[PDB]
Design a protein around this ligand. Structure first.
Ligand SMILES: CCCCCCCCCCC(CCCCCCCCCC)(CO[C@@H]1O[C@H](CO)[C@@H](O[C@H]2O[C@H](CO)[C@@H](O)[C@H](O)[C@H]2O)[C@H](O)[C@H]1O)CO[C@@H]1O[C@H](CO)[C@@H](O[C@H]2O[C@H](CO)[C@@H](O)[C@H](O)[C@H]2O)[C@H](O)[C@H]1O
Ligand SMILES: CCCCCCCCCCC(CCCCCCCCCC)(CO[C@@H]1O[C@H](CO)[C@@H](O[C@H]2O[C@H](CO)[C@@H](O)[C@H](O)[C@H]2O)[C@H](O)[C@H]1O)CO[C@@H]1O[C@H](CO)[C@@H](O[C@H]2O[C@H](CO)[C@@H](O)[C@H](O)[C@H]2O)[C@H](O)[C@H]1O
Ligand SMILES: CC/C=C\C/C=C/C/C=C\C/C=C/C/C=C/CCCCOC[C@H](COP(=O)(O)OCCN)OC(=O)CCCCCCCCCCCCCCCCC
Ligand SMILES: CC/C=C\C/C=C\C/C=C/C/C=C/C/C=C\CCCCOC[C@H](COP(=O)(O)OCCN)OC(=O)CCCCCCCCCCCCCCCCC
Ligand SMILES: CCCCCCCC/C=C\CCCCCCCC(=O)N[C@@H](CO)[C@H](O)CCCCCCCCCCCCCCC
Lengths: 642, 642
């Protein structure tokens, strides 16, 4: 009437050593009775119950329950017509008892006014603590009783229970059995219960004894004892032979993140700290650089004083303190030494980045050098020069020092003339740099790396959240419990995409506000298309999190896969160094990576202000869309023939 | 009397809603009998057994087992005089049955010859599969049977068993109970067993009924039954009121890593390919940049051909193809456009990086400009210049393009002299750079980031490996099982340090071999001192993983703690950018970070060849040692009061 199983096979393990849990099996459960399923091992009964509710799909079998096959649109197994208690405690923490009751009632479509009566009745009957207590703050027995109350709340016509009374007090166990007997009799309710107390299953109506994947007997307990003349059942076994369902899922997802402070800090406060620290340390020009100066045109007094005095008008008095007046104060500090040997010794230590030497004949030789032109003898060309020894072990510092020293002389050369009706253009190399077409004369390395930092934060934090949430929830039977309740797989997936979309929108707003408004990173292009590209890259990472969760079953295995691809793609996507420095063969391969073309597209919009119509901009838009499709296809193809 | 317990109080919960697991409880176990604990809930029995074996301590009470308090002298609890079967399966996977028995027998000091006989007897007795099957490849019942065999193998005088028979067939249950009765037959053996099947405890000599954290009664089963004529125990419970243990651990640790392929890929193959990709993509100079050339001194033919021809001796034929002959071909690609306006349009698209635009009067004006000197009119000063419009949105590209355009003119100017029998020194700016004190004239950025990629890989690979290994083993109960076998915490920590030290030595060798011997990263200092500092940073990360494992209890919490400190310290340790770019306040704070002074010390040795005697070199050695002491102090304090 209620359940009928015929020829049900199932096995686990490899082909060489298979663990046969189920073999040729026959079961018939009458409507309106308590059945009772006793077996030597707890795995076969669990597999049978999971196949009955329709969540395991055993091979080469036949299950008929409440109209037809589970989940076939001819029966009512997935929905409010059955009440399922799993073997594990498939309950959400950080939720009170009343909140759990309300959530599961909203899933089953009960009115909020008729849920309170059931909640109070179950609280009184099952000896439970206050309804405001969090589930994670309860003990194992209390949590199991709360799960039982959840299974009993909606009054189903079929109850499938997996060890409801395992560590319950004998008085409470007796009361529970009396309640089950009462609701079963004089009604249309059927109970299928598996227990370890064989004697306790004496009020049951049709005991089915399970052994070696088959049923040794299935018949009334009293009559079974009558046939063999036994006073206990123990020695008989000794045989030597749908929108409202989306609000509930959406509300639950937002409350789980809000009540986890550590989760809120990792996905919202961690990105802000990286942006703040990156904009304060990476890309700025060094400023604290010390140079050793040996000016032999002036008396030496101290390592911090030189008395650099000269007449600013004309007559070219010193021309060596005049040159040092044009040195940029922001990046270079000046220290003074008495000998070139002692100044060089400072550079050989960590006391200076370079040494400058002026001979006592510098002024006269320099004045004569410009007055002779191409007729200057080698003597005046020797004494009219500044000897510079530099520490070039640091690439960025050496570039700054050389550029500042050279640009300081250009200002010095253009300052000597100009008041004498001489155009400063006489002191220019024929190679003349006009106004830059893009950018300025002082480009910043922070502006080059900033586009890649934004995309990597949004992409890789969507992989971690999606992979962990789906793996954890699937591994403790939380998805399976909701599927039996009548929640379709398309509704669960829809609610996950919406929740992740809102999360990544908050991250995008926070990252862009600090980078642009606070730290002054330039954005020459349209900010509308900058947001769209950032959101699309976040959705690309979410689809990659579907792939990881579809192939991994432990959380420790998922993080290794994520970190195993987070490192190689960072070094090949041109985030910290220009892509033009790579070898040609490696450069071509890198263009097919998920983030390479999008980082280039974002950089052009921020640094050059290019529009969406430029090929270099929309090429990164299309590469993100293709990777989204590829990631979704890979995740589906895992289950296509499996 | 084997066990005596008096007034043992224990609870598990918060002060607001305490969960009193134990209350005033008295328990007495006699020598040579079977004692059965038959509590209603498994929390009290498990806690009592754990307190008896010493792995847990209760708030107030007294425990006396086999001579005294467990864990101290006199008592023989943590040793081979007891046999413990924990509630959960505490066996190592990836190990065969035989290897498990040999490992545990080696722990107990038994000879390899007597372990074989016990293994054969237990395999025959417990109906276990072949001895060569891996533990991870068995079902949930065979694993429990192997755990029971491990408990029984070394023949102890006191057996503490936590549900030895739960899913066992009754046919095997009868044999197991018969074996227990036969071994406990007028001897020194004592068995304490908790079972769900109350009637199976009829063969036990004493029965202890547990309820509400105490014992309702403690008497023989037959005396208890003959109190009012009861014929079963169901109604009775219805009441309303050191050289050889380190070697074994060392061999086990290396075998677990070798038999986990995914573990060796993450810690040995990932760092090698991370170094390879860094040395191929990061730090190199762009070498494919395109420039649009407008040369009106010659006819226009194509975008790839120009017919640049000139004489080499004298007479200054064209001087525009002579300058373009001095351009570096390794980094600049020349494209030709017919008009200056069309060449700028190429730069406004992604087709070029700059424009040159030689004027049709360049040759005549350049020779007149260099033959007049200070008497050059503005007309020849305008026609003799090269007008460069550059794309300056990229900082590193703009440095290369400007540097190469100006150095190619220096060779061009030096070539014009000498061919005219003139001094080449006449084309020198009075700022003359001598031979560098450190480094060369062409510094590399990949030589700046290499000292700091080595340290980052070694440091953070020890945090992840140490934290995961210690957290997983404590949760699964393997650590507690080995403590009751007589393995002190000193040898567990000693064997873990040696295993991590060998792993970090292999990582160091692989990183330095590929970075220096294969990719040619310079090492001007002592290689031996470079090795010492790298290993020192590895041990520093190991001690940081000790703190994380002592604080966290789940692997997902430890990963977020490690990643939450990996991101900030990397951006503040001067790895990818010089430390001189950040503000002074931020630079002061960053010097106290674990990896900041060590990165500076390693860079000095590799790039300058400095010795250990230099203050900039041995500050990184002292900063690393101090952080090791601080990390070992924090972890010890955490375990002291938590
Ligand atoms: C777009 C997708 C929408 C989905 C939105 C929903 C997502 C929420 C997922 C929640 C989640 C995933 C975290 C994912 C990490 C993300 C980064 C990835 C990792 C980086 C690569 C957070 O996980 C929780 O994080 C907490 C952080 O606060 C942590 O708390 C710790 O640190 C705190 C801080 O210091 C500190 O104060 C606190 O003391 C610490 O305990 C919890 O221990 C930890 O479990 C896991 O949920 C957890 O599941 C647990 C049982 O599995 C569940 O345990 C309860 O339930 C059972 C009986 O009912 C039973 O098991 C337990 O007896 C019971 O307790 C927890 O209740 C639940 O929370
Ligand atoms: C300093 C020296 C320390 C000691 C040596 C260190 C290693 C010791 C711990 C080893 C360890 C932690 C590794 C984490 C370290 C790195 C994390 C860093 C994180 C970075 C952020 C690796 O864990 C292994 O990782 C495997 C990866 O290969 C993975 O296998 C997966 O991918 C494979 C690939 O194809 C694929 O074939 C395979 O099918 C996949 O499953 C499994 O999870 C596991 O085998 C955990 O050990 C595991 O413990 C498991 C019980 O929990 C134990 O479970 C087994 O047995 C149980 C019977 O009690 C039974 O109940 C379980 O059902 C059964 O499964 C595993 O057997 C054992 O191995
Ligand atoms: C950023 C995006 C970049 C690229 C995107 C994509 C490319 C392709 C798109 C999809 C294809 C693949 C994704 C990855 C999959 C691949 C499939 C198969 C894995 C299935 O994984 C099963 C279990 C987990 O299985 P389990 O948990 O036990 O569940 C039971 C199921 N059997 O993995 C584990 O343990 C492994 C744990 C980490 C293993 C390595 C970590 C780091 C790698 C470093 C090594 C690199 C060097 C290369 C080695 C060669 C040199 C000798
Ligand atoms: C290279 C780096 C080296 C050194 C760095 C520097 C200094 C080192 C001094 C180190 C000492 C300690 C650090 C540990 C501190 C303290 C304990 C806490 C957790 C103890 O733990 C509890 C459970 C785990 O507890 P549980 O697993 O449940 O076990 C039960 C035990 N109650 O953690 C969790 O959930 C946390 C999961 C991730 C939380 C955040 C992740 C990323 C942080 C980003 C936020 C940054 C911005 C700050 C926010 C302020 C502005 C609003
Ligand atoms: C997807 C998995 C990650 C989950 C969480 C992702 C959330 C956001 C990610 C980064 C936030 C953006 C903040 C910096 C990320 C991108 C921006 C940047 O500036 N990146 C550079 C510096 O961070 C770049 O990474 C430099 C690498 C050179 C050194 C390489 C050594 C690598 C060690 C390998 C072994 C250590 C293992 C430790 C634990 C094993």
């Amino acid at each position: 009437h209620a359940v009928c199983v015929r020829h049900a096979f199932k096995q686990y393990g490899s082909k060489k050593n298979p663990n046969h849990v189920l073999s040729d099996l026959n079961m018939t459960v009458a409507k309106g009775t308590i059945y009772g399923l006793l077996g030597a091992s707890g795995c076969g009964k669990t597999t049978l119950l999971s196949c009955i509710v329709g969540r395991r799909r055993l091979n080469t079998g036949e299950i008929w329950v409440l109209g037809g096959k589970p989940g076939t649109k001819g029966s009512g197994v997935p929905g409010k017509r059955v009440g399922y208690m799993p073997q594990e405690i498939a309950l959400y923490g950080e939720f009170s008892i009343k909140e759990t009751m309300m959530y599961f009632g909203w899933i089953f479509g009960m009115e909020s006014s008729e849920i309170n009566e059931r909640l109070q009745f179950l609280l009184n009957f099952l000896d439970l603590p206050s309804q405001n207590r969090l589930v994670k703050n309860l003990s194992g027995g209390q949590q199991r009783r709360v799960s039982f109350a959840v299974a009993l709340m909606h009054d189903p016509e079929l109850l499938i229970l997996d060890e409801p009374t395992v560590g319950v007090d004998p008085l409470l166990r007796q009361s529970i059995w009396n309640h089950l007997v009462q609701i079963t009799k004089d009604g249309n309710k059927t109970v299928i219960i598996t227990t370890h107390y064989i004697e306790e299953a004496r009020q049951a109506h049709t005991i089915g004894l399970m052994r070696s994947g088959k049923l040794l007997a299935e018949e009334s307990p009293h009559v079974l004892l009558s046939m063999y003349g036994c006073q206990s059942l123990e020695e008989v076994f000794l045989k030597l032979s749908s929108w409202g369902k989306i609000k509930a899922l959406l509300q639950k997802n937002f409350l789980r993140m809000w009540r986890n402070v550590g989760v809120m800090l990792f996905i919202f406060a961690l990105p802000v700290m990286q942006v703040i620290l990156f904009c304060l340390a990476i890309g700025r020009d060094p400023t604290g650089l010390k140079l050793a100066i040996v000016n032999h045109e002036k008396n030496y007094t101290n390592q911090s004083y030189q008395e650099c005095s000269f007449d600013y008008g004309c007559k070219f008095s010193y021309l060596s303190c005049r040159y040092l007046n044009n040195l940029r104060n922001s990046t270079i500090l000046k220290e003074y030494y008495p000998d070139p040997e002692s100044a060089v010794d400072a550079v050989k230590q960590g006391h200076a980045w370079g040494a400058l030497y002026f001979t006592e004949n510098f002024t006269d030789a320099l004045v004569a050098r410009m007055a002779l032109g191409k007729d200057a003898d080698p003597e005046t060309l020797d004494q009219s020069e500044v000897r510079v020894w530099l520490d070039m072990s640091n690439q960025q510092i050496g570039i700054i020092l050389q550029r500042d020293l050279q640009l300081s002389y250009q200002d010095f050369a253009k300052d000597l003339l100009g008041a004498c009706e001489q155009n400063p253009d006489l002191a220019e190399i024929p190679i003349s740099f006009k106004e830059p077409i893009y950018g300025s004369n002082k480009p910043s390395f922070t502006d080059f790396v900033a586009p890649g930092v934004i995309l990597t934060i949004v992409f890789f934090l969507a992989v971690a959240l999606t992979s962990s949430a789906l793996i954890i929830e699937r591994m403790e039977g939380l998805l399976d419990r909701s599927w039996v309740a009548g929640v379709t797989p398309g509704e669960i997936l829809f609610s996950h995409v919406v929740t992740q979309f809102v999360v990544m929108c908050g991250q995008t707003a926070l990252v862009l506000i600090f980078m642009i408004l606070v730290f002054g990173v330039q954005c020459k292009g349209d900010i509308g298309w900058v947001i769209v590209l950032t959101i699309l890259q976040g959705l690309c990472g979410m689809c990659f999190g579907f792939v990881i969760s579809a192939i991994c079953e432990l959380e420790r295995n998922a993080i290794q896969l994520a970190l195993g691809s987070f490192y190689p793609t960072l070094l090949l996507s041109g985030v910290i160094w220009p892509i033009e420095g790579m070898p040609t063969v490696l450069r071509y391969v890198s263009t097919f990576l998920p983030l390479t073309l999008a980082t280039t597209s974002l950089r052009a919009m921020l640094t050059r202000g290019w529009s969406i119509a430029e090929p270099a901009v929309y090429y990164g838009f299309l590469a993100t869309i293709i990777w989204i499709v590829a990631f979704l296809t890979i995740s589906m193809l895992v289950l296509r023939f499996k």
